[PDB]
Amino acid sequence: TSILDIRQGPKEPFRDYVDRFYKTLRAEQASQEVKNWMTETLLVQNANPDCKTILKALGPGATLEEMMTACQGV
């Protein structure tokens, strides 16, 4: 399965999705800078509308514990 095919379900907790992401990211062998680009970009983009909304409110500069606690009720 390709990294672009990794997406969050409509009922799937973000948490279970983030695990899937760094597992597939774990099978990507690209430069770190590209993998940083993938992190800030693709993760949020394939996140579900309800959490996506939430993550837009965190702004930039956000870290994984704060994202992970931010989308917990969703």
Partner: protein
């Protein structure tokens, strides 16, 4: 493998059955998963080419992958021979011969020869050259076997 003895010299000692079986069990359980590569790397510490063919030859199953790896090992070996040409004139009596891709793959060399190269001063890391080919070929497999 080639290990350091108490006396303070590097000598060959055989690899252990529950090490062998641990190699088997990893492959059984985690197949092509990435954790196989650090795992391999730890269990290949101080290992010979000869021991590395033993580990590859003792696999059962996943024969498409095993063939892809073989063919990667030969490609990487062909590339060793290309990049490093044979040296000028006859081999000195006082010296031992430079390795080829097939000596690195363990095929054309004997154990005592593999111990000569590694234990001698300077030493040459023919394990680590095969190790990269294995890891490189492991990346090929991992990338393919991603679904």
């Amino acid at each position: 493998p080639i290990v350091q003895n108490l006396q303070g010299q590097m000598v060959h000692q055989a690899i252990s059955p529950r090490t062998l079986n641990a190699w088997v069990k990893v492959v059984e359980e985690k197949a092509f998963s990435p954790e196989v590569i650090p795992m391999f790397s730890a269990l290949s510490e101080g290992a010979t080419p000869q021991d590395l063919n033993t580990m590859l030859n003792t696999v059962g199953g996943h024969q498409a992958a095993m063939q892809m790896l073989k063919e990667t090992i030969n490609e990487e070996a062909a590339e060793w021979d290309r990049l490093h040409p044979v040296h000028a004139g006859p081999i000195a009596p006082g010296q031992m011969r430079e390795p080829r891709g097939s000596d690195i793959a363990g095929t054309t060399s004997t154990l005592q020869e593999q111990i000569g190269w590694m234990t001698h001063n300077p030493p040459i890391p023919v394990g680590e050259i095969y190790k990269r080919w294995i890891i490189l070929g492991l990346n090929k497999i991992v990338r393919m076997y991603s679904p």
